[PDB]
Amino acid sequence: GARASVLSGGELDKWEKIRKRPGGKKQYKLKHIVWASRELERFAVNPGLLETSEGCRQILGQLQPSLQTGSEKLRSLYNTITVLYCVHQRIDVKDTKEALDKIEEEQNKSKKKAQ
Amino acid sequence: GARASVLSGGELDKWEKIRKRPGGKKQYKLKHIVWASRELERFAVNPGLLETSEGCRQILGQLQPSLQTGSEKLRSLYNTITVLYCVHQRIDVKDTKEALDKIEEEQNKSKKKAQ
Amino acid sequence: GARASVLSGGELDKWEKIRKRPGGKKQYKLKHIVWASRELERFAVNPGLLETSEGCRQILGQLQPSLQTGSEKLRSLYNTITVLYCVHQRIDVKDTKEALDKIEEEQNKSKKKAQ
Amino acid sequence: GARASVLSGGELDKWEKIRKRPGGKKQYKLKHIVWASRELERFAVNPGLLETSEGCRQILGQLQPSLQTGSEKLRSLYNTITVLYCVHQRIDVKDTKEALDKIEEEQNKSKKKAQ
Amino acid sequence: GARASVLSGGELDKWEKIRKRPGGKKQYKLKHIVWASRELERFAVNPGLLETSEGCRQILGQLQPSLQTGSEKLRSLYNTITVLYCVHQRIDVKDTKEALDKIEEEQNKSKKKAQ
Ligand SMILES: *C(=O)CCCCCCCCCCCCC
Ligand SMILES: *C(=O)CCCCCCCCCCCCC
Ligand SMILES: *C(=O)CCCCCCCCCCCCC
Ligand SMILES: *C(=O)CCCCCCCCCCCCC
Ligand SMILES: *C(=O)CCCCCCCCCCCCC
């Protein structure tokens, strides 16, 4: 059943199409997904949350006060999970800037009805 | 990313613990997802819809008028798709009969707000 | 009682005396029923529906929407189910057209009491 | 009858100039027509309807109930028949996208008889 | 798509059952279609008009006010087009006279709606 993720136009096929910068050439690779698990394990957060959008969103919500002064690894991890949230929301983001704008669109859409 | 799904509590931890026959000593295995994938391909239906609860539920909606007249293979597929729906919904069902109770429970629940 | 499978003047004796095409001199065989089971098995329908009128009505209801554009084999199965219905009701019909007229007349009577 | 279908200036001559993508490298070939006739007999649809526009439209209707959750091959078959319908209607489409627009675009006139 | 015309029950198969004489024995043949194409080229007439009823109707309309003077060949062409017209409406006529009546018969209703 996990095979759905490797079908043409599925989530792992969609992931390695996404560009790092909005006009750049180098792409996102799946190695960043594996890398994320060990960082979550280090700080004692459950990697099982990266299975769905709803799980990814809990991680993204947690790190919001830390993020502003965060290291380059922490900000990059936040951007890496941001893309997993966008991919799990079925959004065909072409790059990081779009994924970040898509999160602001998701947060604006979410927050407006949840004050 | 499919590592997350096999961590305990994930979808492919839950899938293989569920009983086939309520007093039976046999449980559902991954072999029945490939069998469902073959039978859906034989019916010219997309097996990628098995990723999600809504895609499984759409397949359950599609095959419902054919169940009254359905074969052992069709009823067995309906039960296979039903358990995948229960797994995607994170419902801790122990067997086929609990999974069937949940579809009937959800359908009667659904009827009340569909009027 | 398997002895009833050779019943003289029964339904099986009549089956072999019913004409396939209405002016044609050639009759229905029991291997047609075996072929009908195999065609039903491909479309995932339960063969036991052949054995009762209650199942035959459901088969016809499911075949009718596809009849008009359906292939000759679909039409011949429709006619085969129609004759089995006439046989289960114990309606003597000499041929396929006679069976079709009797079943449409019985169905027409049913649809006046179906609302 | 319609032997004109394989002559210069005819339906095939036009068929093989229709592109897959507006400026695309590949075009449609005659052998898709032969394959489609074989596929229809598997579903048990009559292969004699294919020489007529309204028979082709009726076949497209018949393919709809599994199209929506349908496999890639079923969608490809439907779109290929759709382009052929446009060819039988003597519509000189530029490409695959136009054949898709023509179905909705022609139906807009007649769908205003149902508003 | 053209195979349908040669599959049993198709338009060529219907063509070939039609009598050349009202209560006759001899019928129309594929080699008459070849002959008809040869007669058309002699007067520089497009064959693509004999694909449909409307094209045939237009040719009959051109032929009609010249028939009184016409040769046995002109009458034969008129009869032949008329038979094709009836075939293209898919009317299983027994003979050439019936096909001719169908044209005058359409005029009894159509010309009365033309004024
Ligand atoms: C999701 O698609 C299931 C994960 C796969 C485990 C291996 C399956 C091997 C199947 C072999 C064929 C069994 C007969 C249907
Ligand atoms: C996402 O996590 C990428 C993972 C790439 C390696 C997968 C290795 C196999 C994981 C499933 C093992 C299941 C054992 C029962
Ligand atoms: C009598 O013993 C009751 C149980 C009957 C079981 C089924 C017997 C089927 C015999 C052959 C039927 C052939 C019909 C074409
Ligand atoms: C009526 O005029 C029908 C023609 C149908 C003939 C079908 C069999 C021969 C194949 C014809 C097409 C070949 C294209 C390469
Ligand atoms: C509508 O039905 C179009 C039918 C086209 C028939 C084409 C048949 C081609 C046969 C090729 C045989 C091999 C030649 C090397």
In DSSP notation, E1-14 reads: -GGGGTSTTSHHHH
Nearest C-alpha neighbor of D39 from the set B44, E7, B35? B44
Question: In sequence order, what DSSP letters do the residues of E45-56 get, joined into one string?
Answer: --GGGGGSHHHH
- Could you give the CA distance from residue C21 to residue B114 in angstroms, rounded to a whole number? 49
Q: What distance in angstroms lies between residue D7's CA and the mean position of ligand 3's atoms?
A: 60
Nearest by CB to C71, from D44, D55, D58: name it. D44
Q: Is B7 in the pocket of ligand 2 (CB under 6 A)?
A: no
For residue D83, the one-letter residue type is: V
Q: Chain B to chain C, count of Cβ pairs less than 8 Å apart? A: 28
Experimental technique behind these coordinates: cryo-EM
Q: What are the tokens at B40?
A: 């859906």
Query: What is the SS3 assignment for C52?
Result: coil
Triad C52, C55, C60: Cα angle to 5°: 120
Query: What is the SS3 assignment for E98?
Result: helix
**By a Cβ cutoff of 8 Å, what residues of chain D touch chain C?**
40-41, 44-47, 49, 55, 58-59, 62
> In the 8-state DSSP scheme, what is residue E88?
H
CB burial readout D7-25, b (16+ within 10 A) else e: eeebbbebbeebbeeeeee
Name the residue in chain B with its Cα closest to that of C44: B71
Triad D78, E6, E76: Cα angle to 5°: 125
Report the residue of B71, B75, B78 to disrupt the C interface, i.e. the one with the largest count of C CBs within 10 Å. B71
Nearest C-alpha neighbor of E1 from the set D77, D72, D55? D55
Q: CA torsion sign, C98 to C103 to C104 to C105?
A: positive
Q: CA torsion sign, B1 to B2 to B8 to B10?
A: positive
**D50 and E1 in contact (C-beta within 8 Å)?**
yes
**E12 and E6 in contact (C-beta within 8 Å)?**
yes
Triad B24, B27, B32: Cα angle to 5°: 125
Contact check, Cβ <8 Å, B5/A7: no
Q: Which atom of ligand 1 is nearest to the CA of A3?
A: 2
User: How many residues in total does chain C contain?
Assistant: 115
**E67 and E78 in contact (C-beta within 8 Å)?**
yes
**B43 and D70 in contact (C-beta within 8 Å)?**
no
Nearest C-alpha neighbor of E75 from the set E100, E48, E51? E100
**B110 and C80 in contact (C-beta within 8 Å)?**
no
- Could you give the CA distance from residue E79 to residue E22 in angstroms, rounded to a whole number? 12
- Could you give the CA distance from residue C75 to residue C36 in angstroms, rounded to a whole number? 12
Query: What is the SS3 assignment for A95?
Result: strand
**E99 and E27 in contact (C-beta within 8 Å)?**
no
Triad D52, D55, D57: Cα angle to 5°: 110
Q: Is C48 in the pocket of ligand 3 (CB under 6 A)?
A: no
Q: Which residues of C touch B40 (CB under 8 A)?
A: none
Q: State the residue for tokens 């004050």.
A: A115
**D14 and D83 in contact (C-beta within 8 Å)?**
no
- Could you give the CA distance from residue A48 to residue B14 in angstroms, rounded to a whole number? 13
Q: Is B35 in the pocket of ligand 1 (CB under 6 A)?
A: yes
For residue D100, the one-letter residue type is: L
Element (H, E) at E34: helix E30-42
- Could you give the CA distance from residue C37 to residue C44 in angstroms, rounded to a whole number? 10
Nearest by CB to B62, from D69, D72, D73: name it. D69
Per-residue 3-state assignment (H helix, E strand, C coil) for B65-97 = HHCCCECHHHHHHHHHHHHHHHHHCCCCCCEHH
Query: What is the SS3 assignment for E105?
Result: helix
Backbone phi, psi, residue A20, to 5°: -65, -35
Instruction: Give the residue, out of E6, E8, E13, E30, with the most ligand 4 atoms within 8 A of its beta carbon, to mutate for a pocket test.
Output: E6
Label residue D90 left, alpha or beta by phi (over 0 means left) and psi (-120 to 50 means alpha): left
CB burial readout B56-86, b (16+ within 10 A) else e: bbbbbebbeebeebbbeebebbbbbbbbbbb
Closest residue CA from atom 13 of ligand 3 = C5
Alpha helices in B1-115 (DSSP H): 11-14, 31-42, 53-63, 72-88, 96-112
- Could you give the CA distance from residue A99 to residue B97 in angstroms, rounded to a whole number? 43
What are the beta bridge partners of residue E19?
Answer: E27, E95
- Could you give the CA distance from residue E75 to residue E66 in angstroms, rounded to a whole number? 10
**By a Cβ cutoff of 8 Å, what residues of chain D touch chain B?**
66, 69-74
Closest residue CA from atom 3 of ligand 2 = B1
Q: Which long-range contacts (CB under 8 A, 24 or more apart) does E12-18 make?
A: E12/D1, E14/E87, E14/E90, E14/E92, E15/E83, E15/E84, E15/E87, E17/E92, E18/E83, E18/E87, E18/E93, E18/E94, E18/E95, E18/E96, E18/E99
- Could you give the CA distance from residue E33 to residue E84 in angstroms, rounded to a whole number? 10
**A81 and A59 in contact (C-beta within 8 Å)?**
yes
For residue E17, the one-letter residue type is: K
Alpha helices in A5-92 (DSSP H): 11-15, 31-42, 53-62, 64-67, 72-88
Backbone phi, psi, residue B87, to 5°: -65, -45
Q: Which long-range contacts (CB under 8 A, 24 or more apart) does C80-85 make?
A: C80/C28, C80/C32, C80/C33, C80/C36, C81/C36, C81/C50, C81/C56, C83/C15, C83/C18, C83/C28, C84/C33, C84/C50, C84/C56, C85/C53, C85/C56, C85/C57, C85/C60
- Could you give the CA distance from residue A51 to residue B52 in angstroms, rounded to a whole number? 12
Instruction: Give the residue, out of B3, B5, B29, with the most ligand 2 atoms within 8 A of its beta carbon, to mutate for a pocket test.
Output: B3
Closest residue CA from atom 7 of ligand 3 = C2
- Give D53: exposed, middle or buried? Use CB within 10 Å, 0-12, 13-18, 19+: middle
Name the residue in chain A with its Cα closest to that of B47: A4
Nearest C-alpha neighbor of D85 from the set D98, D73, D74? D98
Contact check, Cβ <8 Å, D1/E3: no
Angle, helices D72-88/D96-111, rounded to nearest 10 degrees: 70
Q: State the residue for tokens 């229709």.
A: D18
